[PDB]
């Protein structure tokens, strides 16, 4: 099996730049007719896959000006020209010149835009759960720059470390930016059993933890 | 246009089977060459198996022998006939078109899930999100909705029904001990809501759920 390392695992970059991607395959990968089946995929964010380049270097049609193949012999390189915000994704090379085909294992294009900060938010449990016993309480950080952030649940200021859900969109083409979500759940019995909830989070955009709470009250 | 639509994702159990189609339009299946590449909840993309303009045959290592695929050019499917499917089998499948001789992947559908696991099917409970106090006076305002405890992926939701999708963000859906946990908000203008109507849309297939919830202003 030929196998293809890419290289950046993660490539951050700001917009206007340009972006290199390499694929290093661990054998030659010429198909016995001769060609080069050598291709590169980019998939969207809750989209498939598609097309870019094929044969090493022929842009599908449809494709924008500034992406472009390159290389030969185990050495294999995308090149982007002027970073677009919807140019944001997973990268995949391929290799078809050798049975059983493979993929590299990707490389994620990540846009590098100013720092923003959070809009955070907190919701009690609604009443239909709390009728169920169950008690869920929930944090967005939306919209927020760079992506590394850190929350934390107090309960009547004591922190809770249990029963904590956290998930985060990819990166929005839209505005360049992260957002995240956070679930606390307990019991109602658990919930009810005291007063003051809130949601706690260090992010670079603030000297200060930002707090977003409520009382059961 | 040219266009593939994968159906048959379904939830199997571990040794089970599962037949997948895909039906081509806007193109002839005969000529170009066809396959199945899949990709893992880890996201890594990973070739199936393939069929030739002249029906030959490839597979891949970890598949050859329990799945089959096919053509129909009469009627443009193709199928891929899973067996003893196991838990790496577990992924979303995408059929794809090539321009034989040229290009492996140049046309791919939109995928169908497949899921190989004991778990059972559960059907989500979703709850509406009101704002608590303060962040509800304000020049905007963020709802939200809860969907808990299903199995298994996907779901699908939206609010009002999908006219309103400016704003939005639904949350990737994160699994603890066979059941799944999802979410979304939406922030729009303090004189959107709760002047008109907010409403989250909820459908999960596997477990047959189709459910809506309106936000509703809060506070006893």
């Known amino acids: 099996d030929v196998l293809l390392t890419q290289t950046p695992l993660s490539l951050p970059v700001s917009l206007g730049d340009q972006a290199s991607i390499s694929c290093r395959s661990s054998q030659t990968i010429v198909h016995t007719n001769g060609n080069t089946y050598f291709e590169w995929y980019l998939q969207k964010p809750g989209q498939s896959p598609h097309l870019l380049i094929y044969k090493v270097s022929n842009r599908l049609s449809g494709v924008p000006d500034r992406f472009s193949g390159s290389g030969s012999g185990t050495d294999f390189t995308l090149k982007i020209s002027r970073v677009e915000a919807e140019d944001l994704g997973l990268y995949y090379c391929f290799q078809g010149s050798h049975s059983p085909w493979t993929f590299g294992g990707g490389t994620k294009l990540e846009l590098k835009r100013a720092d923003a900060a959070p809009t955070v938010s907190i919701f009690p449990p609604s009443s239909e759960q709390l009728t169920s016993g169950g008690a869920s309480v929930v944090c967005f950080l939306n919209n927020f720059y760079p992506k590394d952030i850190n929350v934390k649940w107090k309960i009547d200021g004591s922190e809770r470390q249990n029963g904590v859900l956290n998930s985060w969109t990819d990166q929005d083409s839209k505005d360049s930016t992260y957002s995240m979500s956070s679930t606390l759940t307990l019991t109602k019995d658990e919930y009810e059993r005291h007063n003051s909830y809130t949601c706690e989070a260090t992010h670079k955009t603030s000297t200060s933890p930002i707090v977003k709470s409520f009382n059961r009250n | 246009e040219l266009k593939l639509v994968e159906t048959g994702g379904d939830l199997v159990k571990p040794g089970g089977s599962l037949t997948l189609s895909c039906e081509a339009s806007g193109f002839t299946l005969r000529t170009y060459g066809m396959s199945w590449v899949r990709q893992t909840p880890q996201m890594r993309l990973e070739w199936v198996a393939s069929?030739?303009?002249?029906?030959?045959?490839y597979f891949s290592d970890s598949v050859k022998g329990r799945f089959t695929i096919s053509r129909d050019i009469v009627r443009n499917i193709l199928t891929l006939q899973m067996s003893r499917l196991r838990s790496e089998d577990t992924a979303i499948y995408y059929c794809?078109?090539?321009?034989?001789?040229?290009?492996?992947?140049?046309?791919w559908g939109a995928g169908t899930t497949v899921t190989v696991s004991s778990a059972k099917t559960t059907a989500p409970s979703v709850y509406p999100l009101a704002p608590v106090c303060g962040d509800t006076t304000g020049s905007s305002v963020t709802l939200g909705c809860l969907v808990k405890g299903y199995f298994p992926e996907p779901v699908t939701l939206t609010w009002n029904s999908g006219s309103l999708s400016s704003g939005v963000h639904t949350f990737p859906a994160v699994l603890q001990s066979d059941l799944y946990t999802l979410s979304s908000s939406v922030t729009v203008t303090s004189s959107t809501w709760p002047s008109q109507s907010i409403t989250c849309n909820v459908a999960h297939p596997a477990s047959s759920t189709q459910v809506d919830k309106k936000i509703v202003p809060r506070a006893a």
């Open positions: 794809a078109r090539g321009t034989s001789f040229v290009r492996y992947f140049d046309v």
């Open positions: 069929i030739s303009y002249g029906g030959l045959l």
